[PDB]
Amino acid sequence: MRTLAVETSCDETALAIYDDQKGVLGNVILSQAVVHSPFGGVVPELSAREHTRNILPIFDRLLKESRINLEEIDFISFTLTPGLILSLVVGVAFAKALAYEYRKPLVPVHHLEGHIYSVFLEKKVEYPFLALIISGGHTDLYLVRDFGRYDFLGGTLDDAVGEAYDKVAKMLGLGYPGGPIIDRLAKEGKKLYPLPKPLMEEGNLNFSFSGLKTAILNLRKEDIAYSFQETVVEILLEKSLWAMKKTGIKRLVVVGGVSANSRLREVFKKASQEYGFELYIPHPSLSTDNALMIAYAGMERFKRGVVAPLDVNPQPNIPLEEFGRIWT
């Protein structure tokens, strides 16, 4: 079985071809970090224009590298939601263009569903399992009981972790994508100046990070990165440990772009060794947005007999739990 997958939910144009017997047949991505960097953020209209310019050159590269014919693709997988609606429609337009032209089914995927299944590309995870999703705009815990069956357990009450890195990096004047800059800079710190905890009670599975910017101002740049990162990663691990104890589930999937952080990976790996739970974190190239994870979740949905009609329409934010009920 074989799918061409399309991801344009945010600021990466990503196409991939995945075969469930042969594995990856193609994988091309163009980031828009260069063009959004003068704004300290992602400008929606600008992102839409870049997707429109870049999607055809990327496709050309995918076809030449993979040497696959579209006639050999069984179905087209694509990110329907959530994301920047103006960018989403470019990818959906391209997918439906190909689907109608080649008479292939359409299979929608939720973007966070892609992140969950990003680890399945290397190893299948037994159900049920916990998923910690940590991206630029999400910091969520879900209990995954089956494909399409995601129970929301908690999420951020203010900033997601990725945004917190961005604000701390800007606040230190360093550049924007904040995560990788802090990850690298924190290796120098050594001295950890302690930081305050949120006001919610222990055992709550929700997250809070934006108050650290208050304590950062109220306070050795490499030690600043070090102390921020250490507090943040420790928050993530504690909430996950609480979630495993509350649920009884000793399988944890950690995904999203912040799952590429090298110190996060140290801490969760250490915890899996000391506590005896199973941990799945993807290769760093699958932590950040890619179409291969979309392709994998598309396979799962297609194999259950679910396809979309030709008039299927993207939306900015369908919640993951609702999406899985609707689409499987």
Partner: protein, 195 residues
């Protein structure tokens, strides 16, 4: 030659087939549905298949940018994969060239809160401008949809002006002297304002 010509500039979406230098098919629908709700379902309903065409034409506006991006992506994808030529066309240019009023000609269209207009002379034209109330010399040209908007010294409003038909006739003429068409990777909506 048989050309499929598409226009997604406005809520009156329309597409045409051009053969023997003339329009042999035109479908025109004013709809409050989202562009992706209508495309490509409306093609399946009308039995329009991209592999049945020798060439493609698409409007780059001016028009609503997200529906232009959608339509341009449909057409670029088909033209690139089938190895067929594609020709872009401009709405304001067509409104001026096809309206036999004296110069100067001021075609204009409304997108959101902006009235975009362009000033044409016999041998030259301006950039696409944004209308701010100014008193303009010459003959305004627009659609009945925008009859309440007056530019220039006198106005002509077309009861109907399906851009995909005029654009497809133009594309046919274009491909006679330039049979390779335009570079498919470079076809993009016209952007008057920045992001």
């Amino acid at each position: 030659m048989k050309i499929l010509s598409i226009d997604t500039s406005f809520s009156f979406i329309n597409f045409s087939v051009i053969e023997e230098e003339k329009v042999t098919f035109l479908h025109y629908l004013k709809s409050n549905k989202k562009t992706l709700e209508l495309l490509p379902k409306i093609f399946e309903e009308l039995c329009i298949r991209p592999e049945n065409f020798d060439a493609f034409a698409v409007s780059v506006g001016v028009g609503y940018l997200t529906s232009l991006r959608i339509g341009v992506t449909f057409v670029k994808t088909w033209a690139y994969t089938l190895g067929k030529p594609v020709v872009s066309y401009k709405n304001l240019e067509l409104l001026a060239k096809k309206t036999p009023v004296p110069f100067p000609k001021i075609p204009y269209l409304k997108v959101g809160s902006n009235v975009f207009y362009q000033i044409f002379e016999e041998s030259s034209s301006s950039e696409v401008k944004v209308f701010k109330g100014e008193e303009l010399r010459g003959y305004g040209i627009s659609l009945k949809e925008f009859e309440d908007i007056k530019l220039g010294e006198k106005q002509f409003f077309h009861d109907i002006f399906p851009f995909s038909a005029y654009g497809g006739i133009y594309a046919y003429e274009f491909l006679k002297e330039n049979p390779e068409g335009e570079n498919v990777f470079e076809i993009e909506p016209i952007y008057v304002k920045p992001p």
